[PDB]
Ligand binder design. Sequence first.
Ligand SMILES: CCCc1sc(-c2cccc(OCCNS(C)(=O)=O)c2)nc1CSc1nc(N)cc(N)n1
Ligand SMILES: CCCc1sc(-c2cccc(OCCNS(C)(=O)=O)c2)nc1CSc1nc(N)cc(N)n1
Ligand SMILES: O=c1ccn([C@@H]2O[C@H](COP(=O)(O)OP(=O)(O)O)[C@@H](O)[C@H]2O)c(=O)[nH]1
Ligand SMILES: O=c1ccn([C@@H]2O[C@H](COP(=O)(O)OP(=O)(O)O)[C@@H](O)[C@H]2O)c(=O)[nH]1
Lengths: 228, 229
Amino acid sequence: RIKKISIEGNIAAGKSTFVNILKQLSEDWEVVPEPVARWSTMEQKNGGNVLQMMYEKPERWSFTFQTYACLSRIRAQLASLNGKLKDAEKPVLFFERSVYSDRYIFASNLYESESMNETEWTIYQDWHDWMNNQFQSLELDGIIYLQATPETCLHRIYLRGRNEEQGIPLEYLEKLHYKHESWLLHRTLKTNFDYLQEVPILTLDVNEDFKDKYESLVEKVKEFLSTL
Amino acid sequence: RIKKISIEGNIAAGKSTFVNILKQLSEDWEVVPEPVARWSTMEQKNGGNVLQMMYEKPERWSFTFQTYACLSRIRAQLASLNGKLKDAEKPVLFFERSVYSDRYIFASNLYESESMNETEWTIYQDWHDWMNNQFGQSLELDGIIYLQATPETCLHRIYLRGRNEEQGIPLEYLEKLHYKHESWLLHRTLKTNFDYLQEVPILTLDVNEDFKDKYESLVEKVKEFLSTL
Ligand SMILES: CCCc1sc(-c2cccc(OCCNS(C)(=O)=O)c2)nc1CSc1nc(N)cc(N)n1
Ligand SMILES: CCCc1sc(-c2cccc(OCCNS(C)(=O)=O)c2)nc1CSc1nc(N)cc(N)n1
Ligand SMILES: O=c1ccn([C@@H]2O[C@H](COP(=O)(O)OP(=O)(O)O)[C@@H](O)[C@H]2O)c(=O)[nH]1
Ligand SMILES: O=c1ccn([C@@H]2O[C@H](COP(=O)(O)OP(=O)(O)O)[C@@H](O)[C@H]2O)c(=O)[nH]1
C-alpha cells in the first residue's frame, strides 16, 4: 500500500539532495538512500573495498561490483518496506536510483566500455532477470527523472568533497546521460521487464541550483503523485 | 512434505553412478543433477565458458564461477520441488550436492588456496546467506547421504570419466577436497551459517569397494535412513 517511485538521474544530477528535501516535507514520505553512496559494518567494509578496486582496476572488478551493488540495493529497499509506513495515510518511499538503473545504465555502460566481456554480462543479466522475477514487491509505482546536462553535471561534480571521485571525464557522463535520455525521455530503450514501457514518468529540469528555491519542483512532484 | 536428500562427496567418487541407480528403483524417487556436472541453453554457453575461463586462471574466475554455479543450483532445486514428483505417495528428492557443497567445500577451498581474495570470499558469503533466505528456504534438507571414499579412487575415475580438460586434474586437489568432507560430515567441526543443519541426520557410506553391479547393501542402508525420517 506504499507507492514506490524511483528518482533517476546522471551522477551529480541532484538526487541525494532532492530526495532529502522531500523527506522533510511529510510523514507519509520516506527515502531509501543509494548503498554505493553509503560506501562512497559488514556491507560498508566490502563495498568500501570493491569500489576502490572498481577505480584502481575496472575490468577485473565490474562484475563483482554490479552484483554486490544490486544485492545491497534490493536488501536496503526491502528493509524500508518493513521499518516504515505501516501506519501512514498516503505512504511514499522514494528510492534513490533503482535495480533498473543498475542494469540499463551503469552495468550496460561498463559492458559497452568493455569492462565486462559477454559471459560476465549474460551472467549478470541472468542473475538480475531471475532474482527480480521472484519478487511486484520492489516494482515501481512511478519514476522521476532528474535531468541535468553533463555541462551541469560536471559543473556540479566538483563541490561535494570526496577524495575518490574527483577524476571523472565528461564523455563518460555523455554515455550515461545518453543512456538516461534514451530510457527515460526519448523512451526507446528495450528492457525485459515489460511494465517499464508503461510506468508513469516525470522529467524535471534540475539545472538551476534548487537548494535555495524548490517549491515548483515539489508541486509537480505532488501533482505527479496524485495521478498514480 | 517431499523429503529432500543431499548426495555428497568427491569429484568422480560416484554420486552420479549412485543417483543414476536410485532414480530407477522407485517411481517415487527423482534426481537433481548438479549444474556444474552438466557444464562439461544460455546457461550452458555461460557455464562451459566460465568453466574453461576458470581452469586457466582460478584466481580471476573463482568468485564468478562460484556465484554462477550456486544460483544455478538454487534455481534447479526449486523447479523440481515445485514441478516434479506430482502424485508420489512417499516422495524423495535426492540432490546431487547442495548449497553447502558449493560454499563450505568449493568456495572455501578456492578462497584458501588464494584464487579468491578476502573481499571476494566475504561478498560471496554475504550473497550466499541471502540468496538462500529470500529464495532458498524450501530447499532445507531432511538428511545428507555421504559417499565416503579415500582420495585415490577418484583420479582413476576421472580417467574413466574421460573428461579431457581434467585429464590430469591434480592429485593434491582431490586430497584437499577430501579433508573438508570429514570435518563437515564425519566430526561436525565445521559449524556453519545455518541453524537446522547441526541437528540433521547424515548417512555415511564407505564406497571404496566398487558397487555399480552390487549396490543392494548400499541401497538397503538408504531405505533404513529414509524411515528414521
Ligand atoms: C560514482 C561512484 C561509483 C562508480 S566508480 C566507477 C568507475 C570507476 C572506474 C572506472 C569506471 O569506468 C569503467 C571503464 N569505462 S571508461 C572510463 O570509458 O574506460 C567507472 N563507476 C561508478 C558508477 S557505476 C554504478 N553502478 C551502480 N550499479 C550503481 C552506482 N551508483 N554506480
Ligand atoms: C568442473 C570442474 C570445476 C573445477 S575446476 C577447478 C580448478 C581448476 C584449476 C585449478 C584449480 O585449483 C584449485 C587449487 N586448490 S588445491 C590444489 O586443493 O590447493 C581448481 N576446480 C573446480 C571445482 S569448483 C566447483 N564448485 C562447485 N560449486 C561445484 C563443483 N562441482 N565444482
Ligand atoms: O542544486 C544543487 C545540488 C547539489 N549540490 C551539491 O553538489 C554536491 C553533490 O550533489 P548531489 O549529491 O545532489 O548529486 P547526486 O549524486 O545526489 O545526484 C553536494 O555537495 C551538494 O550539496 C549543489 O550545490 N546544488
Ligand atoms: O561404484 C562405482 C562408482 C564410480 N565408478 C566410476 O567412476 C566414474 C565417476 O563417477 P561419477 O561420475 O558417478 O562421480 P560424481 O562426480 O558424480 O561423484 C564413472 O566413470 C563411474 O563409472 C564406478 O565404476 N563404480
